[PDB]
Design an enzyme around this catalytic site. Structure first.
Site, PDB file in Angstrom:
ATOM      1  N   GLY A  13      -3.007  -5.542   2.217  1.00 34.77           N
ATOM      2  CA  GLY A  13      -1.744  -4.982   2.683  1.00 34.77           C
ATOM      3  C   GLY A  13      -0.689  -5.642   1.668  1.00 34.77           C
ATOM      4  O   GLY A  13      -0.944  -6.583   1.067  1.00 34.77           O
ATOM      5  N   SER A  14       0.689  -5.155   2.115  1.00 33.16           N
ATOM      6  CA  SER A  14       1.744  -5.917   1.460  1.00 33.16           C
ATOM      7  C   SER A  14       1.843  -7.315   1.808  1.00 33.16           C
ATOM      8  O   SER A  14       1.566  -7.720   3.284  1.00 33.16           O
ATOM      9  CB  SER A  14       3.121  -5.178   2.003  1.00 33.16           C
ATOM     10  OG  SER A  14       3.091  -3.809   1.660  1.00 33.16           O
ATOM     11  N   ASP A  42      10.525  -1.049   2.693  1.00 39.22           N
ATOM     12  CA  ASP A  42       9.290  -0.590   2.290  1.00 39.22           C
ATOM     13  C   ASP A  42       8.424   0.309   3.102  1.00 39.22           C
ATOM     14  O   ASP A  42       7.334   0.511   2.802  1.00 39.22           O
ATOM     15  CB  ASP A  42       8.447  -1.777   1.962  1.00 39.22           C
ATOM     16  CG  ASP A  42       9.231  -2.853   1.270  1.00 39.22           C
ATOM     17  OD1 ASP A  42       9.885  -2.488   0.428  1.00 39.22           O
ATOM     18  OD2 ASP A  42       8.986  -4.082   1.532  1.00 39.22           O
ATOM     19  N   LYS A 102       6.663   3.741   3.712  1.00 42.74           N
ATOM     20  CA  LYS A 102       5.784   4.584   2.631  1.00 42.74           C
ATOM     21  C   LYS A 102       4.597   5.074   3.539  1.00 42.74           C
ATOM     22  O   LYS A 102       4.141   4.540   4.495  1.00 42.74           O
ATOM     23  CB  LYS A 102       5.207   3.774   1.272  1.00 42.74           C
ATOM     24  CG  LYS A 102       4.523   2.356   1.646  1.00 42.74           C
ATOM     25  CD  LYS A 102       4.500   1.729   0.330  1.00 42.74           C
ATOM     26  CE  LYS A 102       3.805   0.342   0.866  1.00 42.74           C
ATOM     27  NZ  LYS A 102       3.748  -0.427  -0.148  1.00 42.74           N
ATOM     28  N   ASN A 145       1.906   2.631   5.123  1.00 41.97           N
ATOM     29  CA  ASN A 145       2.438   2.023   6.129  1.00 41.97           C
ATOM     30  C   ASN A 145       2.408   2.759   7.460  1.00 41.97           C
ATOM     31  O   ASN A 145       2.783   2.286   8.425  1.00 41.97           O
ATOM     32  CB  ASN A 145       3.816   1.393   6.020  1.00 41.97           C
ATOM     33  CG  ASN A 145       3.944   0.214   4.753  1.00 41.97           C
ATOM     34  OD1 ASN A 145       4.733   0.260   4.123  1.00 41.97           O
ATOM     35  ND2 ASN A 145       2.978  -0.623   4.763  1.00 41.97           N
ATOM     36  N   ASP A 177       4.265  -3.390   9.064  1.00 46.79           N
ATOM     37  CA  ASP A 177       5.202  -4.388   8.127  1.00 46.79           C
ATOM     38  C   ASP A 177       6.597  -4.393   8.539  1.00 46.79           C
ATOM     39  O   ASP A 177       7.475  -4.540   7.704  1.00 46.79           O
ATOM     40  CB  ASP A 177       4.847  -4.366   7.036  1.00 46.79           C
ATOM     41  CG  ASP A 177       3.308  -4.594   6.495  1.00 46.79           C
ATOM     42  OD1 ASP A 177       2.751  -5.106   7.229  1.00 46.79           O
ATOM     43  OD2 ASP A 177       2.985  -4.428   5.219  1.00 46.79           O
ATOM     44  N   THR A 214       5.300   2.627  -4.678  1.00 50.91           N
ATOM     45  CA  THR A 214       6.183   2.019  -3.859  1.00 50.91           C
ATOM     46  C   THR A 214       7.475   2.624  -4.358  1.00 50.91           C
ATOM     47  O   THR A 214       8.541   2.937  -3.712  1.00 50.91           O
ATOM     48  CB  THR A 214       6.628   0.863  -4.007  1.00 50.91           C
ATOM     49  OG1 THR A 214       6.494   0.213  -5.511  1.00 50.91           O
ATOM     50  CG2 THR A 214       5.486  -0.326  -3.017  1.00 50.91           C
ATOM     51  N   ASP A 252     -24.281 -32.102 -10.736  1.00 47.59           N
ATOM     52  CA  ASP A 252     -25.829 -32.147 -11.195  1.00 47.59           C
ATOM     53  C   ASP A 252     -25.931 -33.735 -11.657  1.00 47.59           C
ATOM     54  O   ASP A 252     -25.682 -33.785 -12.964  1.00 47.59           O
ATOM     55  CB  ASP A 252     -26.085 -31.132 -11.950  1.00 47.59           C
ATOM     56  CG  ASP A 252     -27.543 -31.032 -12.368  1.00 47.59           C
ATOM     57  OD1 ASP A 252     -28.404 -31.786 -12.006  1.00 47.59           O
ATOM     58  OD2 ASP A 252     -27.916 -29.925 -13.207  1.00 47.59           O
ATOM     59  N   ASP A 266     -15.836   5.157 -27.019  1.00 45.41           N
ATOM     60  CA  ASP A 266     -16.446   6.258 -27.680  1.00 45.41           C
ATOM     61  C   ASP A 266     -15.520   6.795 -28.821  1.00 45.41           C
ATOM     62  O   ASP A 266     -14.659   7.494 -28.788  1.00 45.41           O
ATOM     63  CB  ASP A 266     -16.550   7.399 -26.827  1.00 45.41           C
ATOM     64  CG  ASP A 266     -17.414   8.646 -27.035  1.00 45.41           C
ATOM     65  OD1 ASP A 266     -17.766   9.278 -26.117  1.00 45.41           O
ATOM     66  OD2 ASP A 266     -18.031   8.603 -28.243  1.00 45.41           O
ATOM     67  N   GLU A 300     -11.989  14.037 -22.674  1.00 45.19           N
ATOM     68  CA  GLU A 300     -12.574  13.668 -21.337  1.00 45.19           C
ATOM     69  C   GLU A 300     -13.887  12.629 -21.408  1.00 45.19           C
ATOM     70  O   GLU A 300     -14.391  12.234 -22.405  1.00 45.19           O
ATOM     71  CB  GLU A 300     -13.444  14.760 -21.062  1.00 45.19           C
ATOM     72  CG  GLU A 300     -14.544  15.600 -21.559  1.00 45.19           C
ATOM     73  CD  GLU A 300     -15.226  16.411 -21.323  1.00 45.19           C
ATOM     74  OE1 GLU A 300     -14.637  17.279 -20.216  1.00 45.19           O
ATOM     75  OE2 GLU A 300     -16.191  16.867 -21.621  1.00 45.19           O
ATOM     76  N   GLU A 358     -17.698   5.333 -18.922  1.00 41.19           N
ATOM     77  CA  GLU A 358     -16.657   5.445 -20.142  1.00 41.19           C
ATOM     78  C   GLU A 358     -15.430   4.825 -19.719  1.00 41.19           C
ATOM     79  O   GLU A 358     -14.704   4.055 -20.115  1.00 41.19           O
ATOM     80  CB  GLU A 358     -16.666   6.722 -21.047  1.00 41.19           C
ATOM     81  CG  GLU A 358     -17.766   6.990 -21.955  1.00 41.19           C
ATOM     82  CD  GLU A 358     -18.119   8.370 -22.089  1.00 41.19           C
ATOM     83  OE1 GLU A 358     -17.315   9.313 -21.772  1.00 41.19           O
ATOM     84  OE2 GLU A 358     -18.850   8.662 -22.893  1.00 41.19           O
TER      85      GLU A 358
HETATM   86  C1  LIG Z   1      -3.975  -2.604   5.290  1.00 39.02           C
HETATM   87  C2  LIG Z   1      -4.759  -2.256   6.838  1.00 39.02           C
HETATM   88  C3  LIG Z   1      -4.964  -0.954   6.664  1.00 39.02           C
HETATM   89  C4  LIG Z   1      -6.101  -3.046   6.343  1.00 39.02           C
HETATM   90  N1  LIG Z   1      -4.103  -2.821   7.855  1.00 39.02           N
HETATM   91  N2  LIG Z   1      -2.854  -3.272   7.765  1.00 39.02           N
HETATM   92  C5  LIG Z   1      -2.370  -3.601   8.866  1.00 39.02           C
HETATM   93  C6  LIG Z   1      -1.192  -4.253   9.176  1.00 39.02           C
HETATM   94  C7  LIG Z   1      -0.989  -5.371   9.709  1.00 39.02           C
HETATM   95  C8  LIG Z   1      -2.265  -6.117  10.202  1.00 39.02           C
HETATM   96  C9  LIG Z   1      -1.972  -7.441  10.683  1.00 39.02           C
HETATM   97  C10 LIG Z   1      -0.720  -8.126  10.683  1.00 39.02           C
HETATM   98  C11 LIG Z   1       0.540  -7.364  10.321  1.00 39.02           C
HETATM   99 CL1  LIG Z   1       1.998  -8.148  10.038  1.00 39.02          CL
HETATM  100  C12 LIG Z   1       0.204  -6.312   9.486  1.00 39.02           C
HETATM  101  C13 LIG Z   1      -3.673  -3.221   9.985  1.00 39.02           C
HETATM  102  C14 LIG Z   1      -3.722  -3.176  11.515  1.00 39.02           C
HETATM  103  N3  LIG Z   1      -2.560  -3.369  12.176  1.00 39.02           N
HETATM  104  N4  LIG Z   1      -4.702  -2.608  11.846  1.00 39.02           N
HETATM  105  C15 LIG Z   1      -5.693  -2.133  10.940  1.00 39.02           C
HETATM  106  N5  LIG Z   1      -5.661  -2.405   9.807  1.00 39.02           N
HETATM  107  C16 LIG Z   1      -4.644  -2.634   9.135  1.00 39.02           C
END
Ligand SMILES: CC(C)(C)n1nc(Cc2cccc(Cl)c2)c2c(N)ncnc21
Ligand SMILES: [Ca+2]
Length: 456
Positions: A17-18, A131, A133, A136, A152, A171, A323, A434, A440, A445
């Site tokens: 995550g962020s 942020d 998006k 989130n 977040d 982002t 060792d 290649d 392609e 590759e």
């Molecule tokens: C990035 C992923 C999708 C794995 N993710 N992120 C979160 C957000 C999160 C999770 C814990 C603490 C904070 Cl501050 C933010 C989160 C959550 N609540 N429940 C399940 N997965 C979560």
């Protein structure tokens, strides 16, 4: 004073995550499951002082809304912050949208009413996201009636954004122009939602480009149009709401509150006119999601391969010094001491919360393998990359929607554009992999290109 590992135990990794990794943890007494974001103080810079962060955390823990993630606890030690909150199991909103057969303005309105309801509430409490998006926007549960949970909120105010592309994928599309020049307020979240809504009803970002800087150039100019065939089947009130949300001057931009009262939200969320399925939009969101996920997996594959090279050599040297006689073999406790020493110098791993987690990981490797430490190193380090290698092939397979087994040069240009790999740099690498290329590449590759693009 309170220690995180004394209260919680790591069960499994949920994902990146962020600002850090997210681990599924469990209270060792009550059995309550929680999602924990572990933020490394070495890798992430703080924008504010300790007292400002503690005061915001205290406020964030008291806030409660159905479309905002619930935060429960906060811990801090010498090297990390641990943000403990509620787990959501429905996944990312866009991964769910592409799984369904039909998607209409009624579905887009229900989604955006929830996001706006969450934003309006957080803005009343003087908390900005910045942020926002699609990544989130998590779905509470796997059921079709699952509420959206924004994750977040408030963290960007206290933690500095990463400059690495592996952390910045996607982002640039949603960031408000005023955030780029430094004077911004809560209206930047309305813009980001405006962008999300534009992508829900057409499947194409309003501000696009062949690389990150070209997208930011489009965002900064603020010009966009509704001149795509797919916009003809969309209502004029939806286009009106988008215009008000993507208004350049933030003081002229509609508020989150007023966006809820807009004709489009009021009409399309009520139970009482014709609403067709936006078929072209679903196809464009599915192509957009596949592209973003393959670029991200390509960047994470390259990052894990470099991290693996650093740790393989470091762990080999730690065991070489340990060792005593030089027979190339060590006992179990020695291997644990050396593996712990790797995390002491290179920083504690998110999956290795304490000594008991390290001892179990060492036991998992010893089950595959007086023991040859070079064999232990190979298996231990291959287990660390397993998720990144499998995520790359899966994302290649998902992107290759016609099961041709290959991706074209135009698709490589698009993928490497989102990954920010210079055009001449990847074309040079393709020729070494290649020599007789025909515009392609197959999966091997493509993986060979990435290995060359990170010094292998
Ligand atoms: C990035 C992923 C999708 C794995 N993710 N992120 C979160 C957000 C999160 C999770 C814990 C603490 C904070 Cl501050 C933010 C989160 C959550 N609540 N429940 C399940 N997965 C979560
Ligand atoms: Ca194909």
């Amino acid at each position: 004073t309170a220690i995180f590992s004394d209260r919680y135990k790591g069960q499994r990794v949920l994902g990146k995550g962020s600002f850090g990794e997210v681990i599924l943890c469990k209270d060792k007494i009550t059995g309550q499951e929680c999602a924990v974001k572990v933020i490394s103080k070495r890798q992430v810079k703080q924008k504010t002082d300790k007292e400002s962060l503690l005061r915001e955390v205290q406020l964030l823990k008291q806030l409660d809304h159905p479309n905002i993630m619930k935060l429960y606890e906060f811990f801090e030690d010498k090297g990390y912050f641990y943000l403990v909150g509620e787990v959501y199991t429905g996944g990312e909103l866009f991964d769910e949208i592409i799984s369904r057969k039909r998607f209409s303005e009624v579905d887009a309105a229900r989604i955006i009413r929830q996001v706006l309801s969450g934003i309006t509430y957080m803005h009343k409490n003087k908390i900005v996201h910045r942020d926002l998006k699609p990544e989130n926007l998590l779905l509470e549960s796997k059921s079709k009636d699952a509420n959206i949970r924004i994750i977040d909120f408030g963290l960007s105010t206290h933690f500095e954004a990463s400059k690495k592309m592996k952390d910045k994928i996607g982002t640039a599309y949603y960031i408000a122009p005023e955030v780029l020049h430094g004077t911004y307020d809560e209206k930047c979240d309305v813009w980001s939602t405006g962008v999300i809504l534009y992508i829900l009803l057409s499947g194409c970002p309003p501000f696009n480009g062949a690389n990150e800087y070209d997208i930011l150039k489009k965002v900064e100019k603020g010009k966009y149009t509704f001149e795509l065939p797919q916009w003809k089947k969309v209502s004029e009130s939806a286009k009106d709401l988008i215009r008000k949300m993507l208004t350049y001057v933030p003081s002229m931009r509609i508020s989150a509150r007023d966006a809820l009262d807009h004709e489009w939200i009021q009409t399309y969320t009520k139970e009482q006119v014709d609403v067709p399925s936006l078929d072209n939009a679903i196809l464009n969101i599915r192509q957009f999601q596949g592209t973003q996920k393959l670029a991200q997996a390509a960047l994470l594959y390259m990052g894990s391969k470099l991290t693996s090279q650093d740790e393989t050599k470091e762990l080999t040297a730690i065991f070489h010094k340990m060792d005593k006689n030089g027979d190339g073999q060590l006992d179990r406790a020695e291997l644990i001491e050396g593996y712990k020493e790797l995390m002491r110098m290179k920083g504690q791993d998110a999956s290795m919360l304490d000594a008991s987690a390290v001892e179990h990981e060492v036991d998992q490797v010893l089950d595959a393998v007086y023991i040859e430490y070079s064999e232990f190193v190979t298996v231990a380090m291959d287990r660390k990359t397993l998720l990144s290698r499998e995520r790359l092939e899966r994302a290649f397979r998902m992107f290759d929607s016609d099961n041709s087994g290959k991706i074209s040069s135009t698709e490589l240009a698009t993928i490497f554009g989102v990954s920010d790999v210079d055009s001449e740099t990847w074309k040079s690498v393709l020729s070494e992999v290649d020599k007789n290329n025909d515009g392609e590449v197959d999966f091997d590759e493509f993986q060979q290109m990435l290995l060359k693009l990170c010094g292998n």
